[PDB]
Structure formats: structure tokens, C-alpha cells
Ligand binder design. Sequence first.
Ligand SMILES: [Cl-]
Ligand code: NA
Length: 129
Amino acid sequence: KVFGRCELAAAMKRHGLDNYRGYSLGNWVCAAKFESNFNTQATNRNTDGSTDYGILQINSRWWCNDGRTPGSRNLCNIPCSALLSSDITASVNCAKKIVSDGNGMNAWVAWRNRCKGTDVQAWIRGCRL
Ligand SMILES: [Cl-]
Ligand code: NA
């Protein structure tokens, strides 16, 4: 599923991401835009052999099991394929664990490089939330 901007904003808000650990909704929408282009089916292979999955590009090195990342952890206790569903529940629930681990949204490289320190409220502007 390729989400609309406002559609995803509303979905994320319903799942409890607005101000989660102090991060306003615009941060999450911006992160999703630059990580996946709002596409739940996005996958990208990393140099170390791990793979990033879904709308928030969650990494199989630490967070999910894809059966092909040796010595890796599954800290969200899910198969990586579940992060590609049109239903964002699994991705949101895992992201809540990630952003809570001490480093906040800096875990997402595109957030750090393209969202952090910008006017992120622009990403939810005009949306009926
Ligand atoms: Cl933080
Ligand atoms: Na893993």
C-alpha cells in the first residue's frame, strides 16, 4: 500500500504516535516519506547483509526475523514480512520500541538527515486529524 500524506498522518495518530516520547506527528510522517516514500512494501539491503523493511525501514539486524541475517536479534519478536502489511500496526508497535531505546528518532538516518531541525509541522498541514 502506498499511503497518502494525510492518510498516513491519521493512521499514525490513531496508533498513538502523536507526541510519542516527545516526537510530534510531523516527525513520523517526514521519516516515513524519506525512508519509504509512504510505501509499506519497501525493502532495502544493507552492506552488512541485513535488510530494512516497510514504511519505516526497520532493520533485520536488531528488530525482526527474516531468516537470512545470521547472529541477528529479533527485539520486536516478529517476522520482517509482517512489517510490509498494508496495516501499519506491527510497524508502529516496533517503532515505539526502537524510539524508546535511548537514541530517539536518530535511529532513522533519513530522519536525522532530512527531518531533524526542520519545520516538520508542514508534513501534517491541511490534514483533517
Ligand atoms: Cl529523544
Ligand atoms: Na533479525
